[PDB]
Amino acid sequence: DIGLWTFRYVYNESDNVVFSPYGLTSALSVLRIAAGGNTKREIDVPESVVEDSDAFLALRELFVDASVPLRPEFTAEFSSRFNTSVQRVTFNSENVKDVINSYVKDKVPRVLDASLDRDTKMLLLSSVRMKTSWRHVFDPSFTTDQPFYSGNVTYKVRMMNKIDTLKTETFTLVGYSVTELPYKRRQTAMLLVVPDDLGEIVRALDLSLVRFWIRNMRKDVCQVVMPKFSVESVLDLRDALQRLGVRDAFDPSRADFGQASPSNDLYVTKVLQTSKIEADERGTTASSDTAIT
Amino acid sequence: LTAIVANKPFMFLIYHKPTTTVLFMGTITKGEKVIYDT
Numbered sequence: 001d002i003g004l005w006t007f008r009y010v011y012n013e014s015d016n017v018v019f020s021p022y023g024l025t026s027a028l029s030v031l032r033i034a035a036g037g038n039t040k041r042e043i044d045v046p047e048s049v050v051e052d053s054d055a056f057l058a059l060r061e062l063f064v065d066a067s068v069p070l071r072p073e074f075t076a077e078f079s080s081r082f083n084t085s086v087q088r089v090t091f092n093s094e095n096v097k098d099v100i101n102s103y104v105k106d107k108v109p110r111v112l113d114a115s116l117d118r119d120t121k122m123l124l125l126s127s128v129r130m131k132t133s134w135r136h137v138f139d140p141s142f143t144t145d146q147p148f149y150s151g152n153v154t155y156k157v158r159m160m161n162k163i164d165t166l167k168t169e170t171f172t173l174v175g176y177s178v179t180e181l182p183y184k185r186r187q188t189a190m191l192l193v194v195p196d197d198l199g200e201i202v203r204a205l206d207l208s209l210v211r212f213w214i215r216n217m218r219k220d221v222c223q224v225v226m227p228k229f230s231v232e233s234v235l236d237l238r239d240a241l242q243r244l245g246v247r248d249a250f251d252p253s254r255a256d257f258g259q260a261s262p263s264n265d266l267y268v269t270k271v272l273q274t275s276k277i278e279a280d281e282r283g284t285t286a287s288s289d290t291a292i293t
Numbered sequence: 294l295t296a297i298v299a300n301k302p303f304m305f306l307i308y309h310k311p312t313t314t315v316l317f318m319g320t321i322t323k324g325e326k327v328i329y330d331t
Contacts, residue, residue, distance in 0.1 A: 003315070004315055004318075007318055011320055012320070012322070013322065014322065014323070015322065015323065016319065016320065016321050016322060016323060017319055017320055018317065018318070018319035019317070019318045019319060020316065020317050020318070021315045021316075021317075021318060022314060022315060022316045022317075049314075050309060050311075050312040050314045052309060052311070052312075055309055056309070056316055128316060128317075130307065130316060130317070146300060147300065147328060148300050148301070148323070148324045149300060149301050150301070150302060150322055150323050150324075153323070153327060154327070154328045154329070154330070155323060155324025155325065155326060155327055155328055156324060156326045156327075156328045157300075157324040157325075157326075159300070168295060168297065177297060179297050186310070187309060187310045187311055188307060188308070188309055188310065188316065189307070189308065189310055190305055190306070190307050191305065191306040191307075191308065192297065192299060192303065192304075192305050193303060193304040193305065193306070194297060194298070194299050194301070194303045195302075195303070195304070198302040198303065198304060198320060198322065201304055202304070202320065205304075207313070207315075210306065210308070210313070210315070211313060214313070220295050221294060221295060222294075222295045222296070222297055223294060223295065223296045223297065224297050225296070225297065225298040225299065225300065226297070226298075226299040226303075227299060227300075227321070227324070229321055231319060231321070233319075275317070275319075277307075277317055277319055279305075284307065286307060286316070286317045288317065
């Protein structure tokens, strides 16, 4: 829902964008254990997110500055629900980054200096990782340079090519197909959507449409010709989340995080996500870290 | 035979089948090396 509806505000006509709706949703779900009143209500998110440890590794940590008083029932509630304890940290010192990166591995995304100010009093961090082969891999020796038509500009991409039997179907509103490429686990899979107008697909995407796709795709023998790709995206989601109704969390006057803190001085300034996806003949490697303030 | 050719801007969704949860998404509108022709 909010996670999936956020993509329409980061989608780019002129660029390659990758995003993790799950990573956003998981972060907001933690943020919700700290909120109360209207602020919590606007964080409209499942209270429990799915987790499956073979299909993808997911991680959730909260770094609160050691000055900040936390209600003991919040850290108890936090620890009991996410099998992890709030990490008290000093957000002004110089090795705070070192402490936090040195903490995430074991159990390192240092592309988070974008998100640490010196007045930062909390860091809510959601990490998503997936590395999995295709069920039926492509053969690299048949991958060839082929053209890619973006409006009137044309590119030379490394295009993969295989024959495989997969679920597929055509659809309208504005003509496109959807094809399911299963990974070797077979609980995760890639839906590939090839349209005559991408921006129209973006403005329509939602979970109903996705389940519709899954019901109406039919097995068939296919030729799949698709590029290898590697994309990294650093996204600022504050504007999108506000447009999706999450407003109180950002407003210092109105932000109720009183379930976490008797301070009444904890609010969200930034929501940042850096994601990277890599697809090639052998499978897919995907990564996403969402940082709230 | 049925031919799927992603040689124009497209969308991908990486989702968890048991729970129908979208893990990753992206749109791909461009390559790196620009090409010209006659």
